Amino acid sequence: SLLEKGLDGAKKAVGGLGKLGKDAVEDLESVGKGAVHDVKDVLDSVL
Amino acid sequence: LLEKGLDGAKKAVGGLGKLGKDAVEDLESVGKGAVHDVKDVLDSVL
Amino acid sequence: SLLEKGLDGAKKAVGGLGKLGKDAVEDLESVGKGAVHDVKDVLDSVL
Amino acid sequence: SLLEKGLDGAKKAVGGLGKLGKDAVEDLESVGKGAVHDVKDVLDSVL
Amino acid sequence: SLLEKGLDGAKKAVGGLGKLGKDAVEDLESVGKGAVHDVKDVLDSVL
Amino acid sequence: LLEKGLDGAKKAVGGLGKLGKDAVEDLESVGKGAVHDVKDVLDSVL
């Protein structure tokens, strides 16, 4: 039925977005934690 | 005092990342439950 | 259907606990790892 | 440096347990969820 | 030093591959578990 | 017997997915420990 295959297509999309999401959010954590490491690096040519 | 502040921002970031992936996970789980719960209803209707 | 809804009540309940156990852990490993880095700082402060 | 290596011994040890606790959980939620689906099958078999 | 920034670039790459990895592997789980759901769907126009 | 077999393959898949993300995680953690452990050594050398 177009229906079950409708809902599975919503389900499939719900999961798609949910990886884009979790991948943006993790790409973010790493930027944040990258930034801070790379700053600290600078506070070491200066130690 | 500086080091201690980098490790503040690094703990802020992680927490913020922890808070964020726990939103994504609760939103996909909503969605999927909707679709499930719509299955169940279009089902008493088979 | 009471019974289909009971069960999904169960499915959902597991998923909480499951995801709720997954924070607990994550929080433990960032604690263990927090103290470590934090001791690396003290011992470094006596470089 | 014994002490730097001690600590990393610790860091690594946490990471095991952490990641080792994360399987335990994952295994619990697929168990709970296993039984559920599996009961949905029985109750369906009396459709 | 080119060195610390060397190693961070390895570190950055180690993590990059480690997302490609974990994303292939999950894209796989879903295909596998997609396939099986969509098969079962077919065994229902036939129930 | 069929249903029971789909739920066999579905449990096979998950396990295989569980086994696989636990390789990726142990390989990135190797790598990163190498880089860390190379830091530590190029460090007694500051």
Ligand SMILES: [Zn+2]
């Ligand atoms: Zn990306």
Ligand SMILES: [Zn+2]
């Ligand atoms: Zn660095």
Ligand SMILES: [Zn+2]
């Ligand atoms: Zn620190």
Ligand SMILES: [Zn+2]
């Ligand atoms: Zn929540």
Ligand SMILES: [Zn+2]
């Ligand atoms: Zn249901």
Ligand SMILES: [Zn+2]
């Ligand atoms: Zn918490």
Ligand SMILES: [Zn+2]
């Ligand atoms: Zn070390």
Ligand SMILES: [Zn+2]
């Ligand atoms: Zn296991």
Ligand SMILES: [Zn+2]
């Ligand atoms: Zn992809």
Ligand SMILES: [Zn+2]
């Ligand atoms: Zn379907």
Ligand SMILES: [Zn+2]
């Ligand atoms: Zn089944």
Ligand SMILES: [Zn+2]
């Ligand atoms: Zn392992």
